[PDB]
Amino acid sequence: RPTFYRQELNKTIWEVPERYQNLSPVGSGAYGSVCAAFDTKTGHRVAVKKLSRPFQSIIHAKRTYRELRLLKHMKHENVIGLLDVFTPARSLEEFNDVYLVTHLMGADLNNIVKCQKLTDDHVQFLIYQILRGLKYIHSADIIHRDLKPSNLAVNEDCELKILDFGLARHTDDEMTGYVATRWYRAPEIMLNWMHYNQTVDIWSVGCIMAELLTGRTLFPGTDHIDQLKLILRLVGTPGAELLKKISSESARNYIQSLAQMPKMNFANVFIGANPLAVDLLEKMLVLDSDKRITAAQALAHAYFAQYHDPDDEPVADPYDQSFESRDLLIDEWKSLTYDEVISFVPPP
Numbered sequence: 001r002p003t004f005y006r007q008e009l010n011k012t013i014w015e016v017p018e019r020y021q022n023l024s025p026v027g028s029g030a031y032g033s034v035c036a037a038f039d040t041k042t043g044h045r046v047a048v049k050k051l052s053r054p055f056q057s058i059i060h061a062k063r064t065y066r067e068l069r070l071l072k073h074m075k076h077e078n079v080i081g082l083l084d085v086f087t088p089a090r091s092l093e094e095f096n097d098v099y100l101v102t103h104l105m106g107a108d109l110n111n112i113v114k115c116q117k118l119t120d121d122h123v124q125f126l127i128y129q130i131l132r133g134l135k136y137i138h139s140a141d142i143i144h145r146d147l148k149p150s151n152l153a154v155n156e157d158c159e160l161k162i163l164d165f166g167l168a169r170h171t172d173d174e175m176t177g178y179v180a181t182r183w184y185r186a187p188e189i190m191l192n193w194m195h196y197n198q199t200v201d202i203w204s205v206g207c208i209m210a211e212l213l214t215g216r217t218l219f220p221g222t223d224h225i226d227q228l229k230l231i232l233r234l235v236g237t238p239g240a241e242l243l244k245k246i247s248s249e250s251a252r253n254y255i256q257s258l259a260q261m262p263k264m265n266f267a268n269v270f271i272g273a274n275p276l277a278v279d280l281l282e283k284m285l286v287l288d289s290d291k292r293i294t295a296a297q298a299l300a301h302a303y304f305a306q307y308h309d310p311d312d313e314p315v316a317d318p319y320d321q322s323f324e325s326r327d328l329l330i331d332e333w334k335s336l337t338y339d340e341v342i343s344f345v346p347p348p
């Protein structure tokens with residue numbers, strides 16, 4: 001067991017191993033507080049997250065276990081990984097606090113799309129890396145659920161990592177009105193007309209790629225209905241074959257009130273774009289989620305010819321998510337989490 005030391009930073013006690021020095025506050029959502037630190041064992045600048053109220057309810061205890069399981073699994077160049085996890089507790093009986101350690105990220109994709117002149121080569125490389133990471137995530141039967149520019153870290157060498165997996169955390173208030181939290185979400189889930197499946201992540205990639213080509217949000221709706229009307233104007237209203245698959249009475253009832261509209265000409269929307277970029281956008285931004293391109297198919301599209309290497313696009317080890325259907329008490333979720341903290345092995 002390492003030696004721990006204590007300090008108070010913005011009204012919070014931080015108890016951490018001596019290896020972590022120069023702690024300075026960076027941020028605090030409702031899920032926890034974050035400090036930047038220098039890790040003297042590895043020489044990395046790191047983010048240290050202290051979870052808030054991790055075992056306050058069954059819902060919260062299960063979310064803690066979910067997050068730790070996911071971060072322990074993810075071992076890929078284009079996905080955030082776990083550098084360390086610790087607790088100051090010396091036994092399960094005194095266990096209350098969980099701290100998560102990752103590489104410190106600087107710029108996100110929001111920063112670079114607002115500010116920098118992107119060539120077609122920059123768009124090819126950034127979207128390639130998102131799809132390489134998504135091939136690996138989807139091979140584990142994990143859905144990200146929250147891909148958007150603020151969840152994509154990018155360094156000065158245009159190298160990209162996916163972070164901030166959806167832990168089923170977003171509220172109705174957070175999705176209301178003129179908000180980036182909704183602009184990247186697939187229609188069939190905006191009002192929960194379809195059960196979630198991995199195809200919703202490819203919709204989000206299409207929205208992100210469009211915004212790197214134009215510098216503008218693709219579907220900046222003022223509310224869920226405004227956003228659906230912007231989507232259907234571009235991709236067309238549902239056809240007969242994609243009404244036959246829509247089981248939700250709520251969906252067919254609103255959908256069938258709208259005047260029918262054809263799919264627009266994407267070369268006239270994305271004026272001047274690489275024709276191969278236009279073609280790939282037409283294959284992602286399809287209303288019928290069964291007919292969307294997959295991450296593995298998209299890596300083999302001609303748009304990525306300069307970067308595609310089918311011997312360097314790895315898949316994940318199998319991921320057991322059977323806990324998601326299991327009914328346990330708070331202390332049972334807490335013991336499972338404790339076990340996962342003590343069994344952690346750091347990366348090479």
Ligand SMILES: CC(=O)c1cccc(NC(=O)C(F)(F)F)c1
Pocket residue numbers: 187188193194238242245246247248251255287288289290
């Ligand atoms: C199976 C499938 O692709 C599916 C299932 C339910 C709803 C929708 N989409 C829509 O209802 C909307 F796009 F018009 F919003 C699509």
Ligand SMILES: [Cl-]
Pocket residue numbers: 002003017018019020
């Ligand atoms: Cl230490």
Ligand SMILES: [Cl-]
Pocket residue numbers: 079080081082103161
């Ligand atoms: Cl990482």
Ligand SMILES: [Cl-]
Pocket residue numbers: 087088089094095096097098
């Ligand atoms: Cl503790």
Ligand SMILES: [Cl-]
Pocket residue numbers: 110148149150151180
């Ligand atoms: Cl964003």
Ligand SMILES: [Cl-]
Pocket residue numbers: 318319320321
């Ligand atoms: Cl597993």
Ligand SMILES: [Mg+2]
Pocket residue numbers: 150151164
């Ligand atoms: Mg985020």
